[PDB]
Structure formats: structure tokens, C-alpha cells
From Swiss-Prot, chain B:
Subunit field text: Homodimer. Interacts with CDK5.
Residues carrying Phosphothreonine: 45
Name of this protein: Glutathione S-transferase P 1
Modified residues (N6-succinyllysine): 86, 99
Residues at which glutathione binds: 7, 13, 35-36, 48-49
SUPFAM superfamilies documented for this protein: GST C-terminal domain-like, Thioredoxin-like
Modified residues (N6-acetyllysine): 111
Record-level Gene Ontology MF annotations: glutathione transferase activity; JUN kinase binding; protein serine/threonine kinase inhibitor activity
Higher taxonomy: Eukaryota, Metazoa, Chordata, Craniata, Vertebrata
Ranges where the GST N-terminal domain occurs: 1-64
Organism: Mus musculus
EC number: 2.5.1.18
Family matches, as CDD domains: GST_C_Pi, GST_N_Pi
Length: 194, 193
């Protein structure tokens, strides 16, 4: 510490890290830019790449599992989350009008794997991997929230993902963040589409 | 262990992990298919090429010595993966028309790696720290295929040019790169490169 996030006036690739810091009871400075990013500072350490930052917070704050297997599975989940996020960004910023239809029908095929993982872990009553929350949970949660906005009801056929979202969102510190002015008045994406 | 790699018959996203295992003197079995790659390490099954590289980094001790090195390594690999993703898109989606634009923008993407090397012992060691990491194996693979895509792309980058030559000379990697299994495997699945 101290922590500082330098990024555009959007939720984009930073909401996950913001919810993580909030939930872990940490404070941070927010530096807004208009026109890579985000840049993150942790005392003397400067970082780039939202996932490099998430893993760094996972390591230092104890949100990276308890062993090799969990660490490996968490990486797997995050990589998957990032693959869908990359597709999403492409839609939003380059083929929203035409591509939206195709994306939404294909969407359920991408969520299924996460539903499967949840069922395999304590009947989807705990976290994505293990018995404790990890950096991966915050990233997945964010991915699900913006998708519900992109296509309402996309989680209808997924009772575990659906429950998981309500469960995590109810966590007091996260609930406060999601209700915060900073969060509420910030668009999901930089182009007004979502 | 044992180690098994299930993947299509291409270099693609698996050559980095193959060079890593070879260089670490480990043995493995290839299971050719025509999402992958799937990798098995004893009772552990993994998917996602980068999740696999990180696991090999953790278990084999190629993930740095501290928090700072681990974070810088993640940063570098993420950088490598961004360029690789663009590369894949070119090769499989807009090769004919898009090749030119790609090659031109290319030097802009390499500069940051050159810069990183200059900062680390005058680029005479590894990408991060004084020891090879899972990140070096990935970066090196990315550089090798780019020299194929655009010969001379490393001309304006003496530190990267030296780095490639240096790491390619490591005995076990040199042996691997000269192996038939590597030699008779297309870089990509569509014949373009």
C-alpha cells in the first residue's frame, strides 16, 4: 500500500479489482484518464494488465487457494473468464448491432462450463474453486453481472450461477460497493453500449 | 507426472510448454487429435495453455523468487498472450489483406520487451530476474514465429535478437528444435504463417 488505480471513467476491466479491494476492506486512490491501462500502484510496485494485477492481489491478500491444484484450477477459471470477456469487448466495440444476436445465442454454451464447475464443488454452495473466495470469484462475478445486462435472463437455465451471483452480491462490503455513487454513475463500457 | 499433452498436430499454443519440458529434462507423451490443449500431470488435468504454463512454473520452480518477480512475470506473459491472440486472428481470419498492417504495427509491440530487457542487467540475462521462467519460454516461441511471419522484424531490436540466439542455443532447447517431431509440425493449422 498505498493503492492507486489509473483508468478511464468506465467499469470495464477494473470493476473486478475494485470489488475485490472493497470486499477485502482496503482503501485506494482512483486516478481518472480520458485518453496501456489500467495502471496499478501498490507502494513501490507499478503494474499493467488487469489480470497481472488481479493475480498480484490474489497472492498478497491470500486469495489464491491453499495448494497447487487450487491455484491451477483458479488460473483455469480466470483464463476462461478472460476468453469470454475478450469476445464481449469485441462485440460491444466493433460489431454490436449485427453481432449481438449471434453472441446471445452462443452465450449459453460458454456459461455451462462454469455451472458444471460449481456443481462439482460442494454442490455449488461455496465458491468457484475451493471453500474460500479468490481473485477468480471477483472476476467471474463481474462477467456474469454485465452479461445479465447484455441479455436479461441469460442465467435462467443456470440455477447455480444464478444463486452464486445473488449470494456474492449480498456480501455486505460488495453490496455497499455496488450501491456506491462511484460505481453507479460509471458506465459499464466506454462507448455507451452494453 | 506422468505428463501428457493432448493437442492438434501443430506447433501453435503448445510449443512453449514443449520447449519448457524439454529444457527442464522432463519426459511426456503426445496425444494427437484432429478446448485443447488438454494437459495431464498425474491426477491433475488442465486446460488453457497459460494455466498449464503457470502450473509448470509453480511445480518446476520457474515462477521467480518473490512477489515482485511473480507479478512482473505475469505482466510479461499477459503481454505475450495479447500479441499471440492478434497473431492468431491474422493467420486464421485476415491473412492476405491484413498481413501488411500487422507487420507495420508489429515493431510497436516489440519495443516494450526490448525495454524490459535493457532494464534487466543490460538484457544479458532473462526477461525477469537472473533465472529462466515460464515467461521466457512463451516469449521466445512468440519471437521465433514472428521472425517467420516477417523476417528481419528483430533487426531494430538488438537485445531481443541476442536473447533469441542465446536461449535457442541452450543444449536441450537446441536439441528439441532440431527434433523431427518439431521439424515436421506446421506452425499453424491452416498452412499459413
Amino acid at each position: 500500500p498505498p493503492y492507486t488505480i489509473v483508468y478511464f471513467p468506465v467499469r470495464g476491466r477494473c470493476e473486478a479489482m475494485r470489488m475485490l479491494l472493497a470486499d477485502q476492506g482496503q482503501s485506494w486512490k482512483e486516478e481518472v484518464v480520458t485518453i496501456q491501462l489500467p495502471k496499478f500502484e501498490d507502494g513501490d510496485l507499478t503494474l499493467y494488465q488487469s489480470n497481472a494485477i488481479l493475480r498480484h492481489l490474489g497472492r498478497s491478500l491470500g486469495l489464491y487457494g491453499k495448494n497447487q491444484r487450487e491455484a491451477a484450477q483458479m488460473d483455469m477459471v480466470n483464463d476462461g473468464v478472460e476468453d469470454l470477456r475478450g469476445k464481449y469487448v469485441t462485440l460491444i466495440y466493433t460489431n454490436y448491432e449485427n453481432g449481438k444476436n449471434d453472441y446471445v445465442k452462443a452465450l449459453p454454451g460458454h456459461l455451462k462450463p462454469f455451472e458444471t464447475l460449481l456443481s462439482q464443488n460442494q454442490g455449488g454452495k461455496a465458491f468457484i474453486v475451493g471453500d474460500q473466495i479468490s481473485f477468480a470469484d471477483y472476476n467471474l462475478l463481474d462477467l456474469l453481472l454485465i452479461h445479465q445486462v447484455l441479455a436479461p435472463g441469460c442465467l435462467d437455465n443456470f440455477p447455480l450461477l444464478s444463486a452464486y451471483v445473488a449470494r456474492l452480491s449480498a456480501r455486505p462490503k460488495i453490496k455497499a460497493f455496488l450501491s456506491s455513487p462511484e460505481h453507479v454513475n460509471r458506465p459499464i463500457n466506454g462507448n455507451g453500449k452494453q
